Amino acid sequence: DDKTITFWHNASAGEGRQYWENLAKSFEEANPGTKVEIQAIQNEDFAGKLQTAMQDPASGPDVFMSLGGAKTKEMIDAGQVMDLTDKISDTVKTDMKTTLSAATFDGKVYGVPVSVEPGGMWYSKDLFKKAGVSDVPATYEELLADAKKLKDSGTDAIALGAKDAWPAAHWYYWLVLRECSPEVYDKSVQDHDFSNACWVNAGKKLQELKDLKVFNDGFLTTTAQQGANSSAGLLANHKAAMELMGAWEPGVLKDLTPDQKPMADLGFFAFPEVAGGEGEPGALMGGVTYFCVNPKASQTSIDFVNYMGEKKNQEDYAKAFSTIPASEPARAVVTDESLKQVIEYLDKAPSMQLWMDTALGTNIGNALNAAVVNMLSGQGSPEDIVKAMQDAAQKG
Numbered sequence: 001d002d003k004t005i006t007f008w009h010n011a012s013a014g015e016g017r018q019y020w021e022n023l024a025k026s027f028e029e030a031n032p033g034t035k036v037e038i039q040a041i042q043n044e045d046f047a048g049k050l051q052t053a054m055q056d057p058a059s060g061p062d063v064f065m066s067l068g069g070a071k072t073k074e075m076i077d078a079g080q081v082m083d084l085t086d087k088i089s090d091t092v093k094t095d096m097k098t099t100l101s102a103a104t105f106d107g108k109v110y111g112v113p114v115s116v117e118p119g120g121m122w123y124s125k126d127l128f129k130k131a132g133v134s135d136v137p138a139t140y141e142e143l144l145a146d147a148k149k150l151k152d153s154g155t156d157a158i159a160l161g162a163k164d165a166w167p168a169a170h171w172y173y174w175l176v177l178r179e180c181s182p183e184v185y186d187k188s189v190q191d192h193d194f195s196n197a198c199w200v201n202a203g204k205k206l207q208e209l210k211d212l213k214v215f216n217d218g219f220l221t222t223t224a225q226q227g228a229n230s231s232a233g234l235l236a237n238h239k240a241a242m243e244l245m246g247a248w249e250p251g252v253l254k255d256l257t258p259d260q261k262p263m264a265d266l267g268f269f270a271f272p273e274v275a276g277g278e279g280e281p282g283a284l285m286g287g288v289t290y291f292c293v294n295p296k297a298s299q300t301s302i303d304f305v306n307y308m309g310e311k312k313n314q315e316d317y318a319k320a321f322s323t324i325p326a327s328e329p330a331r332a333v334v335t336d337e338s339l340k341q342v343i344e345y346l347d348k349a350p351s352m353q354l355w356m357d358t359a360l361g362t363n364i365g366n367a368l369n370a371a372v373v374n375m376l377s378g379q380g381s382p383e384d385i386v387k388a389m390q391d392a393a394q395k396g
């Protein structure tokens with residue numbers, strides 16, 4: 001059946017999970033005969049099942065969340081993603097111009113975005129004040145100093161979902177972005193060249209954080225978003241002072257609070273500048289969530305991804321996920337004070353890089369993320385991290 005489509009997403013939080021249910025039925029009532037069969041998938045399994053299912057597109061999902069960056073390009077090159085350049089709506093083209101560049105490859109659009117989520121530090125304002133930190137750290141040393149004060153204050157300074165690998169790696173990403181010059185960074189991503197001292201230095205700076213032992217005790221067995229004891233859950237329940245995460249954070253937090261309501265004292269501050277770093281000041285790194293269409297899918301799928309781009313639907317998305325919607329007009333409904341900061345910093349930032357692992361691809365990304373965890377477990381060095389990236393890069 002054409003008008004029956006298979007829809008894959010990663011919304012495991014209650015409110016966002018329900019948004020998709022309500023969106024599907026809304027699309028089903030406006031387009032009688034259509035049927036959207038939804039599959040909710042935990043984020044850490046998403047890349048695995050998508051790549052596994054799409055090696056035979058005939059029996060894969062019709063509409064699915066993209067993996068992003070080079071990971072999207074891997075699927076595009078493999079013939080697993082449909083060109084939507086001449087298929088996206090005038091609404092999507094107009095309202096979502098800036099986020100559309102993240103789904104644009106070789107001058108061709110391969111998805112409809114729904115949110116833009118820059119990275120940064122999310123923290124408890126109350127835990128900070130309870131440690132004598134009345135001002136956000138502007139530099140990396142200040143951040144280390146503040147973590148010391150939090151540790152003395154009895155609380156774990158930094159929640160880290162190291163079992164999922166990438167949340168730990170995010171500290172390495174940001175440090176590389178801050179240490180390496182914009183060109184060294186660009187060419188390193190484009191050419192997979194990690195020979196510059198940038199990459200070791202960033203690993204060394206991160207090793208210093210590790211040696212302070214200011215993480216939550218079970219960080220190696222802690223996931224990012226699963227349960228009250230996840231790194232996000234620790235922040236939500238004030239068991240930890242902060243964590244380094246994408247702007248999906250407030251929506252994840254409001255799912256893990258004891259009342260499942262928005263975290264009352266959530267604040268945001270950009271990743272600190274690094275003294276002696278050649279990185280461009282104020283350089284953003286983040287994500288852009290968009291949805292792709294199976295090359296073997298019907299027009300019904302196309303009508304569905306464009307339906308997401310609708311301003312009303314984008315706003316309900318912003319409310320349900322407590323995030324920044326991809327649609328510019330839809331951003332008018334954002335009320336979370338920490339998010340309105342991020343939107344402000346978004347409009348006046350020079351660049352926004354994608355996540356480092358998603359920008360380097362599956363092979364390099366997974367190698368890098370694992371290597372960081374190895375170094376953090378004491379079973380690795382900053383040099384091993386770079387060695388791991390170079391090793392995986394041989395495959396492509």
Ligand SMILES: OC[C@@H]1O[C@@H](O[C@H]2[C@H](O[C@@H]3CO[C@@H](O[C@@H]4CO[C@@H](O)[C@H](O)[C@H]4O)[C@H](O)[C@H]3O)OC[C@@H](O)[C@@H]2O)[C@H](O)[C@H]1O
Nearest residue numbers: 010011012013016043044045046047067166248287355357
């Ligand atoms: O390739 C897909 C997937 O991404 C990899 O993790 C990423 C990471 O993905 C983000 C993580 O968290 C998600 O936030 C969700 C938002 O709304 C809630 O309903 C929900 O339950 C949360 O899971 C988010 O949407 C993803 O974009 O982002 C940064 C990367 O460094 C990292 O690779 C996983 O390995 C892979 O399975």
